[PDB]
Amino acid sequence: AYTTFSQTKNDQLKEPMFFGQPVNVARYDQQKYDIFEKLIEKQLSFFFRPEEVDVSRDRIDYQALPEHEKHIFISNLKYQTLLESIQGRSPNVALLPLISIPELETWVETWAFSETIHSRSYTHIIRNIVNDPSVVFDDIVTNEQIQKRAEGISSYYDELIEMTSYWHLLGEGTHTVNGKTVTVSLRELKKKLYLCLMSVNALEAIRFYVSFACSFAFAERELMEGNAKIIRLIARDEALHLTGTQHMLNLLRSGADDPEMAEIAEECKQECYDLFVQAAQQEKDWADYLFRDGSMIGLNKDILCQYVEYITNIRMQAVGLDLPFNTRSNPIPWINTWLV
Amino acid sequence: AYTTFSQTKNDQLKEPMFFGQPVNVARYDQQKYDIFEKLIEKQLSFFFRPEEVDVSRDRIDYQALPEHEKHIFISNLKYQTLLESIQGRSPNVALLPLISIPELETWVETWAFSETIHSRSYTHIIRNIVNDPSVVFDDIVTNEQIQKRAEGISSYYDELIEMTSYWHLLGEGTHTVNGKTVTVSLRELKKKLYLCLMSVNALEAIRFYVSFACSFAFAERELMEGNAKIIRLIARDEALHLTGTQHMLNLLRSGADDPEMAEIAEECKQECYDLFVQAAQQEKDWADYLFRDGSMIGLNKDILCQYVEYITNIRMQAVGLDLPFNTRSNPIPWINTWLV
Ligand SMILES: [Fe+3]
Ligand SMILES: [Fe+3]
Ligand SMILES: [Fe+3]
Ligand SMILES: [Fe+3]
Ligand SMILES: [Hg+2]
Ligand SMILES: [Hg+2]
Ligand SMILES: [Hg+2]
Ligand SMILES: [Hg+2]
Ligand SMILES: [Hg+2]
Ligand SMILES: [Hg+2]
Ligand SMILES: [Hg+2]
Ligand SMILES: [Hg+2]
Ligand SMILES: [Hg+2]
Ligand SMILES: [Hg+2]
Ligand SMILES: [Hg+2]
Ligand SMILES: [Hg+2]
Ligand SMILES: [Hg+2]
Ligand SMILES: [Hg+2]
Ligand SMILES: [Hg+2]
Numbered sequence: 001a002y003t004t005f006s007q008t009k010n011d012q013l014k015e016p017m018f019f020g021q022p023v024n025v026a027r028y029d030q031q032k033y034d035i036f037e038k039l040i041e042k043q044l045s046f047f048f049r050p051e052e053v054d055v056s057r058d059r060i061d062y063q064a065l066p067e068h069e070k071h072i073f074i075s076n077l078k079y080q081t082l083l084e085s086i087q088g089r090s091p092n093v094a095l096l097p098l099i100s101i102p103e104l105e106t107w108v109e110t111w112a113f114s115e116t117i118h119s120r121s122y123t124h125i126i127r128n129i130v131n132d133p134s135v136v137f138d139d140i141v142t143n144e145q146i147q148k149r150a151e152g153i154s155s156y157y158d159e160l161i162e163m164t165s166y167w168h169l170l171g172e173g174t175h176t177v178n179g180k181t182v183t184v185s186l187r188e189l190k191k192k193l194y195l196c197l198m199s200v201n202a203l204e205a206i207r208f209y210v211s212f213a214c215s216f217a218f219a220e221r222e223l224m225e226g227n228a229k230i231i232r233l234i235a236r237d238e239a240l241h242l243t244g245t246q247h248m249l250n251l252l253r254s255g256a257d258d259p260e261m262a263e264i265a266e267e268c269k270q271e272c273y274d275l276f277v278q279a280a281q282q283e284k285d286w287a288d289y290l291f292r293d294g295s296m297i298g299l300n301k302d303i304l305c306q307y308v309e310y311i312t313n314i315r316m317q318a319v320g321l322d323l324p325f326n327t328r329s330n331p332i333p334w335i336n337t338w339l340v
Numbered sequence: 341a342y343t344t345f346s347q348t349k350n351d352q353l354k355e356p357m358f359f360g361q362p363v364n365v366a367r368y369d370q371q372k373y374d375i376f377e378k379l380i381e382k383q384l385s386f387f388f389r390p391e392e393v394d395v396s397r398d399r400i401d402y403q404a405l406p407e408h409e410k411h412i413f414i415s416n417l418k419y420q421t422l423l424e425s426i427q428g429r430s431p432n433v434a435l436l437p438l439i440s441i442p443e444l445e446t447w448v449e450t451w452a453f454s455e456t457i458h459s460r461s462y463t464h465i466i467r468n469i470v471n472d473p474s475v476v477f478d479d480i481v482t483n484e485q486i487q488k489r490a491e492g493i494s495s496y497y498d499e500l501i502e503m504t505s506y507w508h509l510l511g512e513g514t515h516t517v518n519g520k521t522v523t524v525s526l527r528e529l530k531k532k533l534y535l536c537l538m539s540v541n542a543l544e545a546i547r548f549y550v551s552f553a554c555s556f557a558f559a560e561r562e563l564m565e566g567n568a569k570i571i572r573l574i575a576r577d578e579a580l581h582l583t584g585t586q587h588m589l590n591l592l593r594s595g596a597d598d599p600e601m602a603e604i605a606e607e608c609k610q611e612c613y614d615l616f617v618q619a620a621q622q623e624k625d626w627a628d629y630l631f632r633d634g635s636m637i638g639l640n641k642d643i644l645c646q647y648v649e650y651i652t653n654i655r656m657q658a659v660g661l662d663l664p665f666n667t668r669s670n671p672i673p674w675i676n677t678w679l680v
Contacts, residue, residue, distance in 0.1 A: 002501060004430045005422075005494040009481045025480050026425035026459040029466070029473045044457075047387055082345075085366040089445065090344045092432045105429065106456050113453040116446050119366040120380075126369070133369040140365050141349045154345040161342060165505040175518050177510070 002097050002168045012101055016258045017251065018193060019186070020100030027102060035247050036103035040110050043240050047114075048233050050121035055128040055226025062129045062224065068293035073224065075290060076214040078140045081122040082150050083207060085140075087115035090157045091200070097164055098193065107244060114237045121230050128226070145289045149282050153203060156196040163189050191264050194252060198272045198319070201245035202279040205315040206308070208238045209339075210283045213307055214290070216338045217299040232338055239340040242315075249319045273316070277324045280312040298334075306331035342437055342508040352441055356598040357588065358533060359526065360440030367442055373591065376443035379584050380450050386580070388573050390461035395468045395566030402469040402564065408633035413564065414470075415630055416554040418480045421462045422490055423547060425480075427455040430497045431540075437504055438533060447584060454577045461570045468566075485629040489622045493543060500536045503529050531604050534592065538612045538659070541585040542619045545655040546648070548578045550623050553647055554630070556678040557639040568678070575679055582655075589659050609661070617664050620652045638672075646671035 006024045013032045015021060031037045062070060091112040099105045126133050140146065166184050175182045212235050219228035255262030265272075287304040295301065309325035317323060330336070346364045353372050355361060371377050402410060431452040439445045467473050480486060506524050515522045552575050559568035595602030605612075627641040635641065649665035656663060670676075 001498065002433070003494060004433065004497040004501075005426055007481065007487070009478055023429070024425065025421070025477050026428055026456065027473065027477045028460050028463040029477075044389065049384065081365070085364065086345050088366055088449065089363070089436060092449065093342075093344065093436050096429060096433050106459075109428065109432065109449075109453060109456055113449060116366065116449055119446075120368050123368040133367070137365050137367045137369070138349060141347065147347065150345050151347070154343060157344040158342070161344075162509065165509055169502065169505055169509070170518070177517055178515050 015100040017101055017104050017248065018095075018098045019190065019258075022097075023100060023102050023105050025102070026106060028106070031103040032101050033103060033247070033251065036101075036107040036244070039240055039244050040103070040107050043110050043114055043237065046233075046236055046240070048117070050117065050124040050230055053124070053226055053229050053233075055125055055230070058125070058224050058226040059129050061218075065223070066294075068291075069218075069296050071293055072214065072290055072296060072299075073218060073227075074136065075143075075145070076211050077122065077125065077227075078136060078143060079146050079149070079286075080208070080211050081119065081126075081137075082140050082146060083153075083203065083211075084115050084119040084122060086150065086153060086157070087200075087203070088112055088119050091115075094157050094161050094164070094196065097168065104248075111241050111244060114241075118234050118237065121234060125227050125230060145286070149207075149286075152278075152282070153199065156192075156199040160189075160192045160196045163192050187260065187264065190258075190261050191268055194249075194261065194265055194268065195272065195275065197245060197249055197252070198275055199279070201242070201249055201319060202276050202315070204238055204242045204245055205318075206279060206311055207283060208235075209311055210286075210304070210308055212339070213304070213332060213335055214299065216335060217296065219338065220298055220334060221296075228338070235339055246318055253320060269321070272319075273321050273324070276312065276316050276321060280308050280324070283308050298332075303331055307335075341511060355440040356601075357441055357444050357591065358438045358601075359530065359598070362437075363440060363442050363445045365442070366446065368446070371443040372441050373443060373587075375587050376441075376447040376584070379580055380443070380447050383447075383450050383454055383577065383580050386454075386573075386576055388457070390457065390464045390570060390573075393461075393464070393566055393569050395465055395570075398465065398564050398566040399469045401558075405563070409558075409636060411633050412554065412630055412636065412639070413558060414476065415486075416551050417462065417466065417567075418476060418483065419486050419489060419626075420548070420551045420555075421459065421466070421477075422480050422486060423493075423543065423551075424455050424459040424462060426490075426493060426497075427540075427543070428452055428459050430494075431455075434497045434500050434504070434536065437508070444588075451581050451584060454581075458574050458577065461574060465567050465570060485626070489626045491622065492618065493539065496536050496539050500529075500532045503532055527600065527604070530598070530601060531608060534589075534601065534604055535608065535611060535615065537585060537589055537592075538615055539619075541582065541589060541659065542616055542655070544578055544585055545582040545658075546616075546619060546651055547623060548575075549651055550644070550648055552679070553644070553672060553675055554639065556675055557636065559678060560638070560674055572678055579680065586658050593660065612659075613656075613661050613664070616652055616656050616661065620648050620664070623648045638674075643671055 003022050006022045010021050091108050095108050126136050130136055167189050170184055172184050172186050212231055215231045218224040251257045252261045253265040284305050287301045291301045310330055313323045313325050343362050346362045350361050431448045435448050466476050470476055507529050510524050512524055512526050552571055555571045558564040591597050592601040593605040624645050627644045631641050650668055650670055653663045653665050
């Protein structure tokens, strides 16, 4: 079972990242993997207050926007708000019960906390550009075009969480529950974690970044500048989150942290590849719904699909997956002015 | 049954604090109880960076400190470190999966996050006053006297977590797990959550404050000035945390939230009372160990016991419980100087 304070004195430097003894003492004078301590420090140094950013001129810019451009901006904003809602709670609920080294535990909480600041940031923006925020927030849960993503994301988390509970409650083996056989395998749980981490890595590395291009395109035309300033701060944080997931995945696949995981990762290689491409395709399909009533200056369906493939190739190569698209240089070099 | 993003469009203003539909959209433009949004805002305004606080002078003070005084200072520090390690992760693992309103969800994550900063604060202090931090940190896990005082904390959380897992996995009813009859009652789960909350209230409002008195006793001597600055920052946060738990508990008691919780609070009033009496005794029994090699002017077993009864009565009255101890004046008025 899981415990909030394992009574066994253990060498936290020798535990695997996940599935080892639950973390007891929270100390930061030493780490098995210093990268996580460096990320905690950097993230703490990046704390910011959304409410302090002036977004008053965004309201007029928005109202002045053509109806199709308002649709593009608001749709994108809703999607970002959805992702931050999930990322503020999920890393904690899903990973905290499985982490066995202190630096990773605190990094996860720090990462999750920064995501909640991002959510508060979007509330700040929304309240400053529309008369009734409720209109926007309610459309997030039910928007068909948006939910054809949250579902896939929430699924990986939910499945991992459920299997984690069965593991902590019953342990490994073949069990019976109300007339049904329930099999609990640590190997399958480890796979569920790897798949979930790969999914979150794509979320942090591609899903967020595709939306940033949408927001900064307005900023290039000197519009929605308050929103832009807030997005730059958020993007600065996501870069850290992506560094974290990449290190977790690379440490797990190399076999240096857990030989079994490396074995499992090699085995589900094609699955992770498809999972990554699927996310890229979902971002691609959004472009259609996004630019249905027309596109705008500096951004269109074609340019967006190009950027998705460009970014996807980079991210997949970063975690050892084959490149799914033809190589090319950045289709929108101007984005570099706004990104880390 | 738990999900990271419930697909049902629900009015978050009408959900109960706990056990309702899992929070989907993280919005901060409105709230059922604005007190939690006010707490989030305040806690964010109190963000501080421990490592900035100079504690080099503390090393000198500590070493030049009389042996028995080093024992008192270090023992108190190790207990505080234990509580922060627990409080940094527990609210998230035990409460997040059960919260149903966005303002409370984020407050818990913000509260827990601040506790991790407190943990980092203690690493900063420990690493700077001792030659080998590993001796201190490892003793935290094995020290029978420390685990004796904290007995009951991790246990409560762990029980709530297991029962919560059974609830999410099997739902309400009587089940058969591996041939054993397992009963899952929402009513009983609610009781467990309520008692866990009263326990955390006692931890935040009593256990932390008794430790602050020991720390400030040195500050009164113009010693351990760096530690003192940090403890003042920590105390500032704990005041918000206990304000939060007192409000959660009293709102539940009022019957304005979940009607069943009002019934439960009433039914287990003797249990609530017993929790405090037990905790108070634990804090007192700790005196024997703390002052085993001698005490200090103004800080001894009798004074500690008087302070424990003093603060316990104050805290119990704040949540509507009868007072177990004889009424009395503050035995250490000098502490007011350091608090608030
Ligand atoms: Fe974010
Ligand atoms: Fe992120
Ligand atoms: Fe604390
Ligand atoms: Fe606290
Ligand atoms: Hg996931
Ligand atoms: Hg995940
Ligand atoms: Hg756009
Ligand atoms: Hg885009
Ligand atoms: Hg995989
Ligand atoms: Hg994948
Ligand atoms: Hg594409
Ligand atoms: Hg393309
Ligand atoms: Hg508890
Ligand atoms: Hg609790
Ligand atoms: Hg004390
Ligand atoms: Hg009860
Ligand atoms: Hg009670
Ligand atoms: Hg009570
Ligand atoms: Hg006493």
